[PDB]
């Protein structure tokens, strides 16, 4: 809250461990391959925009 | 000799001809469909289906018998019961639930 | 549902066609579980 | 009808499956305030 | 028997009068499309609008 | 939309109107305003607010 | 079903086992 140098105030981070969980939706091999045909192919790209 | 061909079911294709019984009976195989996530999902069950189709001026039933059981075996028994109806279309039903058996004691004597 | 669909058209107070079929099918060992829809 | 599209996979409401409408895929948020 | 080739489209939006646009997309009916090999030689079906 | 939307033939957004006369007494002020609303477009006294 | 399982690619029913 108040705009002083941390540096010199001696607050330090140490990061100990980093990873990453990745969350799967569980759906049949059946239709997840048959999406991810249909999403590989050059029509089906996904476009993304900055806000 | 032989009245309705229509396929009601696009998906399913005729594989013989409309036999007759001596009713009609015809057997339609399926066509191809979607993948399935694995092989052992088609002929996996015993839960047989027996579905009624509008009548057509005729009554259509599409019964749906798992693959295991043997063709000519549910021929046969489906040749049955349709002679079975044919014939057929009682009392002993009704005695089956709506003539109960105490309220049967009044008419019978008095 | 299974590859096999048979087909019977029947010429033609309580239905009678659709219980017999079920009794014609359950008499089959290997079946169970007979469903009845219309 | 459920052989020609993707019916089975969306969540029935009896007898009639629960699609979108057809101009329901893709989005467009995007302002600089 | 080869395919016949397909009309590319280009559309026009706005002051935009060339945009490039590719085929609308339509859900698969049997009365107005229907599924024909691209080559008559190996089966790759597709939808046609007949 | 750029097709009959928006006109470029140097209109303005927002117009002022001097009064045309004004009179004051003890009791209320009336003022008179002359409002042209143009020759080839629309007004609507949603706005017109009186400052 | 089909045919049965398939067997490894290149009395058979019945024991009869008694007597003691």
Do not use: C
Request: net charge negative; charged share 20%.
């Amino acid at each position: 809250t108040l705009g002083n140098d941390l540096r010199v105030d001696g607050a330090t981070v140490n990061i100990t461990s980093v990873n990453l969980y990745a969350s799967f939706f569980p759906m049949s091999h059946n239709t997840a391959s048959t999406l991810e045909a249909m999403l590989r192919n050059d029509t089906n790209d996904q476009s993304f925009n900055d806000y | 000799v032989v009245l309705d061909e229509s396929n009601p079911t696009p998906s399913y294709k005729p594989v013989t001809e409309q036999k007759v019984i001596l009713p009609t009976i015809q057997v339609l195989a399926s066509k191809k469909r979607r993948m399935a996530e694995n092989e052992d999902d088609r002929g996996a069950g015993s839960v047989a289906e027996v579905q009624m189709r509008e009548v057509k001026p005729i009554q259509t039933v599409d019964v749906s018998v798992p693959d295991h059981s043997t063709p000519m075996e549910v021929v046969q028994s489906l040749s049955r019961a349709a002679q079975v109806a044919q014939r057929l279309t009682v009392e002993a039903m009704d005695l089956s639930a709506p003539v109960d058996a105490k309220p049967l004691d009044l008419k019978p004597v008095d | 549902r299974g590859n096999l669909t048979y087909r019977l058209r029947i010429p033609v107070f309580l239905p009678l066609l659709a219980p017999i079929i079920a009794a014609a099918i359950g008499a089959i060992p290997g079946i169970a579980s007979v469903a009845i829809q219309a | 009808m459920d052989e020609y599209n993707y019916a089975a996979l969306a969540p029935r409401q009896g007898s009639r499956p629960m699609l979108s409408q057809w101009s329901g895929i893709g989005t467009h948020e995007m302002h600089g305030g | 028997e080869v395919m016949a080739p397909q009309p590319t489209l280009v559309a026009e939006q706005g002051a935009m009068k060339a945009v490039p646009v590719i085929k609308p997309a339509q859900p698969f009916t049997p009365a107005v499309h229907e599924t024909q090999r691209i080559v008559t030689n190996l089966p790759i079906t597709t939808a046609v609008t007949r | 939309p750029t097709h009959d939307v928006t006109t470029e033939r140097s209109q303005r957004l927002q117009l002022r109107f001097v009064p045309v006369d004004r009179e004051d007494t003890q009791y209320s002020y009336k003022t008179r305003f002359q409002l042209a609303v143009g020759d080839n477009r629309v007004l609507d006294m949603a706005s017109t607010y009186f400052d």
